[PDB]
Every structure is written in C-alpha cells, then in structure tokens.
Design an enzyme around this catalytic site. Structure first.
Site, short mmCIF file in Angstrom:
data_model
loop_
_atom_site.label_atom_id
_atom_site.label_comp_id
_atom_site.label_asym_id
_atom_site.label_seq_id
_atom_site.Cartn_x
_atom_site.Cartn_y
_atom_site.Cartn_z
N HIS A 5 -6.28 0.79 2.47
CA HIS A 5 -4.75 0.94 3.38
C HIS A 5 -4.54 2.44 3.35
CE1 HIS A 5 -3.09 -2.42 5.31
NE2 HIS A 5 -3.02 -2.99 4.15
N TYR A 55 -4.78 -10.86 9.66
CA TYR A 55 -5.89 -10.34 8.52
C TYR A 55 -7.15 -10.80 8.96
CZ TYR A 55 -1.86 -9.20 5.40
OH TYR A 55 -0.79 -8.81 4.69
N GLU A 83 0.72 -1.15 0.00
CA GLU A 83 0.04 -0.05 0.05
C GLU A 83 0.64 1.20 -0.03
OE1 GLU A 83 0.44 -2.37 2.59
OE2 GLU A 83 0.20 -1.27 4.61
N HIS A 133 -8.30 -3.89 -1.36
CA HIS A 133 -7.39 -4.07 -0.09
C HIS A 133 -6.41 -2.87 -0.14
CE1 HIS A 133 -5.74 -6.41 3.37
NE2 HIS A 133 -4.61 -5.73 3.02
N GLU A 134 -5.69 -2.75 -1.09
CA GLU A 134 -4.49 -1.72 -1.14
C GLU A 134 -5.26 -0.33 -1.07
OE1 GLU A 134 -1.86 -2.87 -0.41
OE2 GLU A 134 -1.96 -5.02 -0.78
N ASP A 146 9.00 -11.09 9.50
CA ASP A 146 8.64 -11.92 8.40
C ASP A 146 8.32 -13.29 8.55
OD1 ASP A 146 9.38 -9.68 6.44
OD2 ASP A 146 11.44 -10.23 6.31
N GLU A 178 -4.17 -4.45 9.31
CA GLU A 178 -4.69 -5.67 8.49
C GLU A 178 -6.25 -5.76 8.61
OE1 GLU A 178 -3.19 -5.94 6.04
OE2 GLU A 178 -1.20 -4.86 6.73
O1 LIG Z 1 6.16 -7.33 5.77
C1 LIG Z 1 5.66 -7.61 6.92
C2 LIG Z 1 4.71 -6.79 7.57
C3 LIG Z 1 4.41 -7.00 8.68
C4 LIG Z 1 4.67 -8.06 9.46
C5 LIG Z 1 3.85 -8.40 10.74
C6 LIG Z 1 3.63 -9.60 11.17
C7 LIG Z 1 2.86 -9.82 12.29
C8 LIG Z 1 2.44 -11.29 12.36
C9 LIG Z 1 1.48 -11.45 13.35
O2 LIG Z 1 0.93 -12.68 13.52
C10 LIG Z 1 1.41 -10.57 14.39
C11 LIG Z 1 1.97 -9.35 14.28
O3 LIG Z 1 1.42 -8.41 15.48
C12 LIG Z 1 2.51 -8.99 13.40
C13 LIG Z 1 5.59 -8.88 8.93
C14 LIG Z 1 6.12 -8.80 7.74
ZN LIG Z 2 -2.83 -5.29 4.10
#
Ligand SMILES: Oc1ccc(/C=C/c2cc(O)cc(O)c2)cc1
Ligand SMILES: [Zn+2]
Ligand SMILES: [Yb+3]
EC number: 3.3.2.6
Length: 607
Positions: free
Chosen positions: A296, A380, A268, A292-293, A372, A315
């Site tokens: 945001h 979501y 986004e 979706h985008e 990641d 999300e």
């Molecule tokens: O590119 C990215 C963007 C956002 C995130 C966040 C991950 C995350 C996952 C969960 O279950 C809970 C949370 O609070 C955060 C990871 C990578």
């Molecule tokens: Zn999103």
C-alpha cells in the site's frame, strides 16, 4: 464527484495542510483542540466552503484573528453533518487561507475506540486508537473527507505523561505540556501529501523494539517480543516492494500491534502500519498481511482512489503486489497457490451476496451506501483476478510488473478513477491494444457475479488440499478409521488452511466426520487464527455443540471483523447457539469497536 462526502469538491477548493493541536481526554473520552486547515481556492470569487463533520461539537471558527460564521446542516446518516463556513473576504483562484476550527469529538466517534485499562494487556492504563478509512476522518476533525484531496500535516498531541502518542507521520519530538504538568505533547510531521483517511493516532502504554534498519515494532510491553519475531521478515519484504514499485518515499516503516478489537488485519497508515494481534501465530505464517500493508505504500498511499467507488484500484493492485513479494520469498508456485485461494474467497463472497448483487461489481456506485456496509473481499479478489488475467494475457509477470512500476510513477501523489487506470493501461500496452480489446471491460468492471473469465493457475500446492478434502467429503462411516494424523504430515499451515477452506465450501459435514477430524487432527489445539477460524466455522455449521463456547470465545476475545462477523452469523444460524449469540453480542456491544458493533448488530438483525 465524491458522493460519500458533503464537503466542497476539489474543483472548488483544496486542503493543502492540516495543523492539528489536540489533547486526549480519557476522563471524558473526548479529543479536544484545533484543526487549522490551509485551504487553496480553485475558484474565482470564493465566499464559502463546506466541510465534513460527524458528531463533532464546534466551538468556533477563526480566520485572520477573528471569529467567522458557520452553520451545521442536518445530519445525513453515516455521512454526518455538513459544515458551511462563511469566508470574511472573497478569494481569487489559487489564493490560500488558514481556517482554524476549535472542536471536540463525541465519545461515540465512529473513528475511535476508547479502551478501559482492563481492556488492555497491562491493566494499568487506558488506550485510544483511530481508524479513519473510509469516511471516519470527519468523526475526528472537520475536513474535506474525500480521497480526492491530498494534504500534508503536522500535529501536536497532549496526553497523560505516562502514555505515548503515535501518528502516521515522522515523530518530531516530545516535551512536557506547559498548560498541564500531568501531560506530554508529542509532535508529528507528515511531509508527503496523503488523503485524510490515512490520518492515524494511537495513545497507550507503548514500548518499541527495532526489527530492521527502518522499522520499529510498537505494542504494549507484553506483546513486544512476540511481535518482534513474527514480523522479522519486514525489511526484506520492503526491499522487494521497493524493487517492484520504486523507492520507498515515506522514511520510516514502523509497525503497531493493536489490542485485539482492531477491526482489520491491517491499516496502511503511512510510516506506521496498524496490524491485528491475531497475526501473532508464532511462526510468521500470516506475514502476507505485512506484505499487503507494505505494498500500500505505493498502491493506495502514492496512487489513490479518487472516490470509494474505485476502491478496487487500491485493493486489487495491492493484493497483486502482495502476492509477488510472497512469490519472491517463497517461489512462483506459492504465488499461484495464494492466487487460486483468493479466487476461492471470491467464490465464497459472490455466493454469500448472490451472483447478481450490486456489491459484487468491481466498481460500485456508493451514493447512498455506507462504505462499511459494502466492504468485502470483492474489490480485493475480483480486483486481483482482473490483473492476474491481464498479466497472463499480456505476456507474463515480468511484463505486467513493468506496467505496475510505470503506473505508480505516473500517478504518484494523485487520486485516480478506473478510467484513468484503463486509459493508462492502453497507453502503456499500445502495441497490444488488440489483445486489450479482447477483454470484456463492461463485465469485468461493471457486472455482478464471478468474472467472465478465470485465470490459469498452477495447482501444484493445492492438489494435496483438494485430495484430502475430497476424501473427507466422500467418506462414509466405515472410512473414518482410515483418517490419521499422518495425513497432515506434508502440509504447511497454508495447506492446512486451504484444506479447511475447501471442506468449509461443502459444509455442513456429518457431525461424526467432524468429531473424527478433531480425534485424528486435534484442530482444537491450533492457535493460528486463520486455521482456528475456519475450523470453528466448519464445526458450528456441521452443528457440533461442543464448538459453541470455542466459537463464542473467539468471536468476543478478538474483534477482527473477518473472523468476528462470520462467527456470530454462524452462531446465530445454529439454533442451539442462537439465543446465546444474540445475548453475548448485547453484553459486549457497548465495549466493542463502534463499527464492528454496528455491523454485527445488523448481521444478527438485532436492535
Ligand atoms: O474502511 C473501508 C474502506 C473502504 C471501503 C470501500 C468499500 C467498497 C466495497 C466495494 O465492493 C466496492 C467499492 O468500490 C468500495 C469500505 C470501508
Ligand atoms: Zn488493502
Ligand atoms: Yb464403505
């Protein structure tokens, strides 16, 4: 406190502005230049501050015309290395200075993917794209790499004159580079304060076509026409998002369609949403991702999670809004169809992780967790499930949409926590605080597994999918003859997708049933990436060897992690395809997106 950031917190100092002057060097796969940070002290007698870096080479740091002292601490894994700068004169509270850091990225920057010409569409020119979310901005430039800090920015980007640079910002002009006639400098301004994860750059052989009064699509020449058609609904989605969330404050809403290794369906980035080319189905059927985008632009970009522990705020609210746009366009029963399908995606994720796994809590503590690694559908879908539950509890969609609009006005240009949100929900619905006190807050926000209560869903569009799927699961061999192409007669692509999602939930099926399914429905001919994905999964999981090369090919010909990760994982758990999966990964690894490469490698338990 932001436990994913090694920088000084917002309570110590705040970046107000970034001026980036940089040059894109495809020969060295480096970006070199200066990041001039306008920093405001929040403390009295401030003498030093700390910044995030990751694999940056610092040349020098200059304040007031002179070089100053700085030190790089030891690397803390995926967080990178903290950079302490020694200020030449102590600062008072609210005093601002400009700090100019001369730096160069590594070829291994986790924010960047560099593509050779043969990795592109035109085959004549290389391509660079960024992806900062969540904590990869530090891998491009020194910054306070936390969504708890919002800044404006300007940038000047020098690139080979035959290429085009674009950023998450209004295009502010182009000229030849004075220091090198083989180059162009493109200029950019972002006047709206944004968290740094929203900073975005692409450089490639880009063209554009206009698709609405405030939207151009960008891509390589050979994608333009298709992209123009696929996303034609963008303006009308925008108007509905504006009706639900309030005014679009960002000026332009452009779309960039990336090469196939882009790791996400969408990002986004303000003024310029990045999308996967796997959206290009030919029929606009995957346009929820645009919604979706678009959404945001309020939820995430205007009101922002303060730390990544509160990512569901971004999300879940965006999914909630996404589904309202699609309901407006295609009817309330479609909203319920997609809502119920998302609950099913939530069942899959809780089943995969395990119902007591920490990554299944709505709010997670990310202190020693790479974001990641934690990323999934939970924030979501469990996020969306929370709001759909509250919606039904508190009086219906029209009432809850008044709260969403008020919630956005309230927290625009800020970063907030789950408590900020819940406090506000209590203020907004003062007259319904007894109803609010019936919710199991501790379970919804902090417990693992599926939520304690399931919302009410209209099943109208879902029933035919469930009916068909149950026919196939309960069928014996003597029933396979009765399956026929006409079975799919009255199903939209969406329903065909849900049919497969349902069947996949009970996979493996007998091999003879899957062979029959290909005989009568010819799912192999479907190029819709969502449908093709779940069909190939059903095949590989039901141990159909003919599907191995089809699955290998989809896994490697695009890099959308949603598809690429579960295909490699399914290929690896299938004994017949295991060694080839591991081998294909090793071959493609060096030319994969650095994050996708990392995560697939872990998935396969390789390297
Ligand atoms: O590119 C990215 C963007 C956002 C995130 C966040 C991950 C995350 C996952 C969960 O279950 C809970 C949370 O609070 C955060 C990871 C990578
Ligand atoms: Zn999103
Ligand atoms: Yb029978």
């Amino acid at each position: 406190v932001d436990t994913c950031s090694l920088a000084s917190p917002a309570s110590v100092c705040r970046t107000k502005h970034l001026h980036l002057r940089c040059s894109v060097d495809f020969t060295r796969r480096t970006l070199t230049g200066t990041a001039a940070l306008t920093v405001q002290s929040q403390e009295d007698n401030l003498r030093s501050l700390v910044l995030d870096t990751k694999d940056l080479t610092i040349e020098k740091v200059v304040i007031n015309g002179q070089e100053v002292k700085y030190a790089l601490g030891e690397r803390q894994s995926y967080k990178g290395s903290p950079m302490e700068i020694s200020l030449p004169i102590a600062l008072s509270k609210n005093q601002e200075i400009v700090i100019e850091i001369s730096f160069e990225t590594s070829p291994k920057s986790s924010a960047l993917q560099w593509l050779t010409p043969e990795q592109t569409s035109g085959k004549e020119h290389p391509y660079l794209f960024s992806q900062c979310q969540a904590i990869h901005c530090r891998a491009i430039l020194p910054c306070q790499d936390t969504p708890s800090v919002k800044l404006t920015y300007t940038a000047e980007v020098s690139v080979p004159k035959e290429l085009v640079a674009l950023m998450s910002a209004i295009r502010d002009g182009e000229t030849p580079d004075p220091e090198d006639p083989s180059r162009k400098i493109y200029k950019f301004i972002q006047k709206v304060p944004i968290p740094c994860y929203l900073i975005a750059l692409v450089v490639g052989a880009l063209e554009s076509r206009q698709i609405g009064p405030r939207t151009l699509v960008w891509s390589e020449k050979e994608q333009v026409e298709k992209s123009a058609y696929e996303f034609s609904e963008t303006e009308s989605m925008l108007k509905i998002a504006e009706d639900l969330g309030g005014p679009y404050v960002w000026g332009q809403y452009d779309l960039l369609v990336l090469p196939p290794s882009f790791p996400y369906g969408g990002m986004e980035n303000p003024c310029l949403t990045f999308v996967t080319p796997t959206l290009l189905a030919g029929d606009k059927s995957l346009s929820n991702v645009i919604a979706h985008e678009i959404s945001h632009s309020w939820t995430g970009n205007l009101v922002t999670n303060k730390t990544w522990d509160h990512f569901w705020l971004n999300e879940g609210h965006t999914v909630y809004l996404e589904r309202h746009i699609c309901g407006r366009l295609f009817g309330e029963k479609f909203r319920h169809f997609n809502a119920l399908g998302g609950w099913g995606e939530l069942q899959n994720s809780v089943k995969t992780f395990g119902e007591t796994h920490p990554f299944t809590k709505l709010v997670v503590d990310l202190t020693d967790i790479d974001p990641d690694v934690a990323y999934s559908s939970v924030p979501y879908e469990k996020g969306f499930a929370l709001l759909f539950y509250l919606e039904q509890l508190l009086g219906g969609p029209e009432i809850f949409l008044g709260f969403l609009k008020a919630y956005v006005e309230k927290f625009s240009y800020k970063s907030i926590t789950t408590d900020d949100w819940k406090d506000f929900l209590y203020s907004y619905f003062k007259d319904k605080v007894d109803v609010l006190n019936q919710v199991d807050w501790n379970a919804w926000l902090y417990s693992p597994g599926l939520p304690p209560i399931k919302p009410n869903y209209d099943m109208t569009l879902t029933n035919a999918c469930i009916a068909l799927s149950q026919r196939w699961i309960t069928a014996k061999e003597d029933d396979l003859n009765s399956f026929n192409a006409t079975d799919l007669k009255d199903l939209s692509s969406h329903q065909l997708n849900e049919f497969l999602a349902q069947t996949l939930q009970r996979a493996p099926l007998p091999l003879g049933h899957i062979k029959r399914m290909q005989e009568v429905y010819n799912f192999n001919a479907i190029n819709n990436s969502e449908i093709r994905f779940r069909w190939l999964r059903l095949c590989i999981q039901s141990k159909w060897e003919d599907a191995i090369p089809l699955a290998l090919k989809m896994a490697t010909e695009q890099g959308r992690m949603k598809f690429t990760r579960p295909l490699f994982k399914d290929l690896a758990a299938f004994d017949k395809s295991h060694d080839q999966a591991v081998r294909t990964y090793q071959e493609h690894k060096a030319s994969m997106h650095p994050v996708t490469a990392m995560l697939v490698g872990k998935d396969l338990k390789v390297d």
